[PDB]
Design a protein around this ligand. Sequence first.
Ligand SMILES: Nc1ncnc2c1ncn2[C@@H]1O[C@H](COP(=O)(O)OP(=O)(O)O)[C@@H](O)[C@H]1O
Ligand SMILES: [Cl-]
Lengths: 18, 919
Amino acid sequence: GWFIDKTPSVKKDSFFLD
Amino acid sequence: LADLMPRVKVQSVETVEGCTHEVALPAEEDYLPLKPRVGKAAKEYPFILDAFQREAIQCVDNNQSVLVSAHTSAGKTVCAEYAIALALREKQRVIFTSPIKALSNQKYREMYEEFQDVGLMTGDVTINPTASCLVMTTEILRSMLYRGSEVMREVAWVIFDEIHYMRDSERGVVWEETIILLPDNVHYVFLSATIPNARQFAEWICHLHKQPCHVIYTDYRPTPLQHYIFPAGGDGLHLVVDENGDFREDNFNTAMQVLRDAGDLAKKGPSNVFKIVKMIMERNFQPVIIFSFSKKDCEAYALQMTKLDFNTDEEKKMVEEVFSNAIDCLSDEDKKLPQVEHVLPLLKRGIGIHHGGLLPILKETIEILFSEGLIKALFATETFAMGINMPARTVLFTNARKFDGKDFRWISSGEYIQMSGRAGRRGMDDRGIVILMVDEKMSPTIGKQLLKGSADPLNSAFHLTYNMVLNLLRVEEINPEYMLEKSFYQFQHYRAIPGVVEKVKNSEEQYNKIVIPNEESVVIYYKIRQQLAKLGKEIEEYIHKPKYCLPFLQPGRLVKVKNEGDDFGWGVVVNFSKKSLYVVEVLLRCAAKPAKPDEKGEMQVVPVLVHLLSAISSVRLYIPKDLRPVDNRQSVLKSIQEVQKRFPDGIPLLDPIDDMGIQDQGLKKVIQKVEAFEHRMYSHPLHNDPNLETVYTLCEKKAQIAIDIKSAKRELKKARTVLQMDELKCRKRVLRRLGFATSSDVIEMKGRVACEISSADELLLTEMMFNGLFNDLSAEQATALLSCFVFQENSSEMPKLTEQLAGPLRQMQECAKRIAKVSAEAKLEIDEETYLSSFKPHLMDVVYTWATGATFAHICKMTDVFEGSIIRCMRRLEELLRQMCQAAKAIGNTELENKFAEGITKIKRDIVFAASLYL
Ligand SMILES: Nc1ncnc2c1ncn2[C@@H]1O[C@H](COP(=O)(O)OP(=O)(O)O)[C@@H](O)[C@H]1O
Ligand SMILES: [Cl-]
């Protein structure tokens, strides 16, 4: 099927990954 | 319209390998090949003529003008000699016009020993005016054409030595002005160097005098050259160009790398020039010319060599004998001059100097000693290259940069061609050599364009001058408008009209043929859709902005992509990342191209730039985890086919404001114009018509043809424009306000006075003369004041001036301010402070004291200006005085004529006006 999404995604931009 | 444009064709004559032959013709006339010469030749030569000489000869045999474009020393003078021969053989007259006096003198010597029926005419000397073959300076020739017709009485040929003088700014306008004034019945021989636009020149001559004009061109060089570079701080020379003319990038890059690390921070003693001329004498490369753009650097480099000796005691005795004989004419007082003492030790040692700063008799004596081989290492200025062919085996460049304006710049390939052309002597050398000293890093591309690159094109520097305008108002046959329309400057900017006008008609014809739209309302529909498309693209740009669209590029998002026209319909995103700009990988229907309408299509994932997305949807359809299979790719294509069905109104798009967050105000007014134009579109009676697309394509074609007509006419109205009319209107306005001519462009007596002044600012001087400034002055201070008008080359600190001299100076500067205010009042680009300071008064005291009787030795102590520059100025002053006499005589003002005449006698004596050794 299909769905409708008008909302975007985000990133903290301050996260430290590991 | 009234298009009185050039209409000239050009044809290519076939010739033997070694030269190329083209001829510029009026388009209406039918080309006619030169027929063979009839009867014995006009001149035989002591050698076998080269191909390019024969062809040029055949032109003159057929009484047709010819431009010969060959390297210096190729044999261009051979052609001119045949013309002179032919005209004398036919009891006609000839004028061999050269740009510089010094060249005219030397050519007169050549022509005299050879034909003997020749005369000379320059600003300084007049020999045998009734001669059938007159050598004369171009400045003289134009002055004669303005004066009378007897100048060209029975003249059948005019020879223009070195047309490059037209590029010059100080004397290139007189050159072009002259050619425009000659009668059409005259035939011309133009001698030049390799120029890339020789054809354009012949076309101008053909458009101008309504006569065929030939172009003979040859890159033939009778002595091949080896070009070397010397990296600063390097031990020796790298061959950058071999005899074959190939550019060795192998040795050029290795030369610049030595240069790159040579200087301090990158890592007493003698001079580098010293070391280069030294190995020159040890490698049998002499005689050599060392070009230096500064007379002060030229004397230093030559004095460094005083430690060495390049002459045999026999050659010494010869130098001393030739030197003492050339001086015997000078007075005892003048032989003691310091310059005579300082140079003879250098000539004895085989060292020589040549620059405008020397005294004329010494400069010429050195030229003589050089042609005799008694000077084996000559340090000369650039001017020495712009003269008669005095070649050497080797040419050395001390500097590669020259100062122009407010910044430094390399020397042009044209200048390198000019000075390097002196290396390589016709029969004496198997190969001349050129050495170039570099001190700053140099790109390889510019090095290739400088050593092997063609000469700079020959473009007109034509500009307006009051002396020209006034003389054209005096003659009742020509007007200044004619001089501009027929100039080479205007011909070069008229050069785009030929192709443009031909395309306008052909298009204007193709426009009336596709003019078959059923009705005129169609154009309204077309313009509506065209606007929507412009708006459409504008919306896309806002959606392209990654700051706005990236957040909504989630896997499965439907996106429409178009690049440079073609589109791939819709597609689904998978993920995105940076590139090198951003890139998203999207399935699309198809380095591949989109799928055609009849094709069922095959989905394929491809990376595409984010600024290639036209629209973005609200829908995110689900995609399979592993998209490697083909069946899954088809499954996605079928899933979107079902989405397009669930939304027949169109796949929903993201509101750029309510959803994407573009709070920009300009996007508001764009979306408003879209909804309004979409309403206008669906309202148009044609929107529903099934023939819409058939009539919308004929409308699109007819619309593009119209776009061409618009831009074509646009450049045509530019090309057809005369560029210097606004200046002319302003200069005529100045002449009106000052009383030189009337509102009806008729010369007033005051104008006829100014006509006689050509070597200086005619306008200022005639104003000074009419204001009664000279009337109270003595001849000695009258002449000293005029020195300000012939001292253009000034670059020294002023002296302390006595009140007797500053008086008339201050008076003169007052009239100068008035000249500037009226020019500005006419809206002429002039700076008042610049105009007053252009007349350098540095030699007021020098000229004044020479006028009183002081010896030349006495006046040299007064100023540090090089002693030769003083004589060059005095010669210009004497020529200007002679003009001033003619100016006062034009109105019968005999009291002023008697004053300038007196000034002449006061300064015309001793070494300043010593007869040239060539005359
Ligand atoms: N076919 C030729 N063969 C040998 N020497 C020639 C030939 N043509 C010209 N020369 C020589 O070259 C010179 C011709 O005059 P030149 O200074 O070379 O004219 P330009 O440099 O303007 O082309 C003369 O010294 C002449 O001896
Ligand atoms: Cl022939």
